[PDB]
Amino acid sequence: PMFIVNTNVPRASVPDGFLSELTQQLAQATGKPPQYIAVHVVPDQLMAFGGSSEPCALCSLHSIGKIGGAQNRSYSKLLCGLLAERLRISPDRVYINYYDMNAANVGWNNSTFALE
Amino acid sequence: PMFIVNTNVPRASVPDGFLSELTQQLAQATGKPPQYIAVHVVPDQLMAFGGSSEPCALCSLHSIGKIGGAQNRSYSKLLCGLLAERLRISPDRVYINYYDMNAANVGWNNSTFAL
Amino acid sequence: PMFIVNTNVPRASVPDGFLSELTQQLAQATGKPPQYIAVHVVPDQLMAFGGSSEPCALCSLHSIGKIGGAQNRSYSKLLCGLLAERLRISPDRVYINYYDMNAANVGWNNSTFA
Ligand SMILES: NS(=O)(=O)c1nc2ccc(O)cc2s1
Ligand SMILES: NS(=O)(=O)c1nc2ccc(O)cc2s1
Ligand SMILES: NS(=O)(=O)c1nc2ccc(O)cc2s1
């Protein structure tokens, strides 16, 4: 999948190894090779959650399949856990948007994933 | 809802209290508690609208329901209004992408809104 | 269309003319007037692709129509070509999310396109 995290937590507070941990945990959680996983972390953002500028995160996870009720709840537990532990963001100040992408709507390497 | 604004307007030109005003106006516009509202403003961006780098904004509004023809037109009038008044961005240089999210596809507090 | 590029390539490596080239090529590829096209480039990003921090890009393209199997493959060839030539990013380290937007879900100029 592609996972993006936007947060008002300062860049200095993002630990060494964070992108690599996200990559590995996402591979494990989805049962996919890490070569497919893209991660993007955007600190120092001007944002508010519930009208408060305390630490928060707005996130997106895109995947061709592997998106659904139980799976998404599991991703949320995993990702909120990591954001709490590594960035000290409270899970109730995190939103994650999940997108189930069609293969034909995902570009890569000069084409898309619809080759049929 | 979740509202994101990306703009080439300078950070200094974003007034104090802008995030609070967005939170308040969105709460009122959608008839929802402000505790649910997330807002995100990203200034100083490298962007062009119609080939020009005069002030512009690219935005998104995500909501679980409360998205639709008439509602979106009302949101657009409101949000373009705020961007024009507060950030001095012309309404014809604003795009807003609206998304009607399923509760099962929105994560929060270690779970989703599908319980 | 609206096209967004997020990349870990440094700001200084984005050439003069890049936004304008993207604007013109997107107009040509979609047949849309350039007046409609919005482009946004975000350099110096903290990202990884396949666990590596070599140059990469995560992109999105939104359009009211003009989205589909063959068209998206054509856009990918075009855009990966530009990112490779201009930003020195390898095409196999680019992801692009395509969105076919309903006109009622796109706001502009105090209203929507519906
Ligand atoms: N099936 S998978 O390896 O998890 C992937 N899904 C997406 C979705 C969007 C996207 O831009 C990239 C990918 S990779
Ligand atoms: N029903 S509501 O309070 O307006 C909400 N909708 C969304 C959608 C996405 C999202 O990430 C967060 C929320 S809160
Ligand atoms: N028909 S078109 O000129 O290519 C456009 N489509 C969109 C979609 C979303 C959006 O935010 C803006 C535009 S312009």
Q: Taking a C-beta distance cutoff of 8 angstroms, is the pair A50, A93 a contact?
A: yes
CB of C32 closer than 6 angstroms to any ligand 3 atom: yes
In whole angstroms, give the CA distance from residue C5 to residue C94: 10
Give the bridge partners for B107, in sequence order: A96, B112
In whole angstroms, give the CA distance from residue B76 to residue B110: 32
In whole angstroms, give the CA distance from residue B45 to residue B23: 22
Q: How many residues make up chain A in this entry?
A: 116
Q: Taking a C-beta distance cutoff of 8 angstroms, is the pair C76, C96 a contact?
A: yes
Question: How many other C-beta atoms can be found within 10 angstroms of the C-beta atom of residue A70?
Answer: 10
Give the residue, by CA position, lying nearest to ligand 2 atom 13. B1
Q: Catalytic residue among A1, A33, A34, A91, which?
A: A1
In B, minimum Cα distance to C43 occurs at B46
In whole angstroms, give the CA distance from residue A15 to residue B52: 39
How many angstroms from the chain centroid is the CA of residue B2?
Answer: 7
The 3-state DSSP class for residue C97 equals strand
- For the record, the structure tokens of A99 come out as 């997108």
Q: Does A1 qualify as catalytic in the annotation?
A: yes
CA of B99 to the centre of ligand 2 (A): 10
Give the bridge partners for B2, in sequence order: B38, B62
Tally of domains in chain B: 1
Whole-number Cα distances in Å, B87 to B16, B57, C10: 11, 10, 28
Residue type, C8: N
Q: What is the CATH number of the domain that holds B47?
A: 3.30.429.10
In whole angstroms, give the CA distance from residue C93 to residue C9: 12
CB of B64 closer than 6 angstroms to any ligand 2 atom: yes
* Contact (CB<8Å) C97/A106: yes
Radius of gyration (Cα) for chain B, nearest Å? 15
User: Could you tell me how many CB contacts below 8 A there are between chain A and chain B?
Assistant: 102
In whole angstroms, give the CA distance from residue C62 to residue C75: 12
Domain extent at residue C60: 1-114
In whole angstroms, give the CA distance from residue A6 to residue A116: 35
In C, minimum Cα distance to A103 occurs at C69
Q: Compute the CA torsion angle A88, A90, A95, A96 (nearest 10 deg).
A: 50
Per DSSP bridges, beta strands C46-49 and C57-63 are unpaired
In whole angstroms, give the CA distance from residue A49 to residue A57: 8
Q: How many residues make up chain C in this entry?
A: 114
CA of A28 to the centre of ligand 1 (A): 15
In whole angstroms, give the CA distance from residue B82 to residue B101: 24
- For the record, the structure tokens of A41 come out as 């972390």
- Structural element, H or E, at residue C39: strand C38-42
The secondary structure of A55-103 as a DSSP string is S-EEEEEEESS--SHHHHHHHHHHHHHHHHHHH---GGGEEEEEEE--G
Q: Nearest Cα to C54, choosing from B32, A5, A38, B20? A: A38
- Structural element, H or E, at residue A18: helix A18-30
Q: For A6, list phi and psi in degrees, rounded to 5.
A: -110, 130
- For the record, the structure tokens of B45 come out as 């961006």
Partner residue facing A37 (CB), from C50, C69, C80: C50
The coordinates were experimentally obtained by X-ray
- Residues of C within 8 A of A108 (CB-CB) are 76, 91-92, 94-96
In whole angstroms, give the CA distance from residue C61 to residue B111: 29
Resolution (A): 1.9
Q: For C65, list phi and psi in degrees, rounded to 5.
A: 75, -175
In whole angstroms, give the CA distance from residue A82 to residue B112: 16
Question: How many other C-beta atoms can be found within 10 angstroms of the C-beta atom of residue C17?
Answer: 10
How many angstroms from the chain centroid is the CA of residue B59?
Answer: 5
* Contact (CB<8Å) B20/A48: yes
